[PDB]
């Protein structure tokens, strides 16, 4: 049966929680929630609970809220955050409108984890990887890869988060959605490591642009204007008269570019930052390239069950998508101890 709530108020909010939580402190908020570090007393963990703001207070935030437990509900793997707990005050759908999730705690973003060595690289791209492996062969794309959206512990282990705590996102992103390309690869995420790698080997940001227009101009000073290869793709004719407008310019030589970076880094960001997205890398093939060669172990490096997204193209009521979350709440099994 139900646990036994109890309720306190935390940033400005109440927060109704199972008491098997204790101590809950306040980490920061994001976009669509809040986050609070607590105790996990039936586990002896510490973990971190989100409480959801205004889940269903229009169509557009249910069908989110949905989206986002459906998600969180679906990976299992070391190197993405998963659930241990999905939670709800309420007695009864009638009640339902709040929703709480729980993970385990993590220590730092990579924000704040940023002088790496090269041995650190390696370990934290490659756990960035694995997780990225896992996650796209669900057909999952992130589209928001970034510094903050990486959580770390002191011993560097790493997992992707699908919203970190709220540095411009745009700086780590692939030139095609900037341009509002119709559709995206995979390797949308792949440039996204690719500009991540590159920060913490350097220290610096890779395209700190102060615009879209800016980051382009950044991106294409280093990787080059297109070639007729990727011109013959290009369906939008303004982007194409465009495009054919800029003064060329050649590709840099990255091993000038990353000066002293180990030269299997170089080589790697070279195959992850192309401008013509079907010829990056993948991340199944980046983890066997001989950078990793330290921890890549291919009969450790999962994919993931199907995940049917078919949600996504249907437009339901307010009430509709709530129930289907309380669907998931109610069906939640929580991972073994
Ligand atoms: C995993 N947590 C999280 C979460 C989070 C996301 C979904 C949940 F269900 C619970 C926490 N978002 N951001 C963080 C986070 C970011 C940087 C460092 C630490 C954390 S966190 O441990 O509070
Ligand atoms: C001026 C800089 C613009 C460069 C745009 C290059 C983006 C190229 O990547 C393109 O990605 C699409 C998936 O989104 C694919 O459908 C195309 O085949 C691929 O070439």
């Known amino acids: 049966e139900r ?29 669509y929630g809040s986050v609070c570090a607590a105790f996990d007393t039936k586990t002896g963990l510490r ?33 993405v955050i998963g659930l241990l707990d999905v939670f709800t005050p309420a007695r009864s759908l009638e009640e339902f409108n709040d929703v709480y999730l729980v993970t385990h705690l993590m ?13 650190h690289v390696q370990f ?26 990486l959580a770390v512990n002191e011993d560097c282990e790493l997992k992707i988060l699908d919203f970190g705590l709220a540095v411009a996102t745009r700086w780590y992103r692939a030139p095609e959605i900037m341009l509002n390309w119709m559709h995206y690869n995979q390797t949308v995420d792949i440039w996204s490591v690719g500009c991540i790698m590159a920060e913490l080997l350097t220290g610096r940001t890779l395209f700190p642009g102060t615009d879209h227009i800016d980051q382009l101009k950044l991106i294409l000073r280093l990787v ?21 407008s800029l003064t060329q310019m050649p590709k840099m030589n990255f091993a000038n570019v990353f000066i002293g970076a180990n030269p299997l880094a170089v080589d790697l960001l070279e195959k992850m930052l ?9 991340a199944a093939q980046a983890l066997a390239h001989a950078y990793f060669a330290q921890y890549h172990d291919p009969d450790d490096e999962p994919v993931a069950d199907p995940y049917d997204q078919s949600f996504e193209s249907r437009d339901l009521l307010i009430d509709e998508w709530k129930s289907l979350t ?8 929580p991972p073994p101890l």
Do not use: C
Not at 225 to 240: C, F, N
């Open 3 to 31: 646990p036994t709530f109890y309720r306190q108020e935390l940033n400005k909010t109440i927060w109704e929680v199972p008491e098997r939580y204790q101590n809950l402190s306040p980490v920061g908020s994001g976009a």
């Open 47 to 79: 973990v971190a609970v989100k409480k959801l703001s205004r889940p269903f207070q229009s169509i557009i935030h249910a069908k989110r809220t949905y989206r986002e437990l459906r998600l969180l509900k679906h990976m299992k793997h070391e190197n």
């Open 107 to 119: 220590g730092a973003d990579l924000n704040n984890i940023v002088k790496l060595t090269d041995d």
């Open 124 to 149: 934290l791209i490659y756990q960035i990887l694995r997780g990225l492996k896992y996650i796209h062969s669900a057909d999952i794309i992130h589209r928001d890869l970034k510094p903050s959206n």
């Open 224 to 244: 080059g204007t297109p070639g007729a290869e990727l011109l013959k793709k290009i369906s939008s004719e303004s982007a194409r008269n465009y495009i054919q």
């Open 274 to 282: 192309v401008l013509d997205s079907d010829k990056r890398i993948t």
């Open 326 to 333: 309380y669907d998931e709440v109610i069906s939640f099994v």
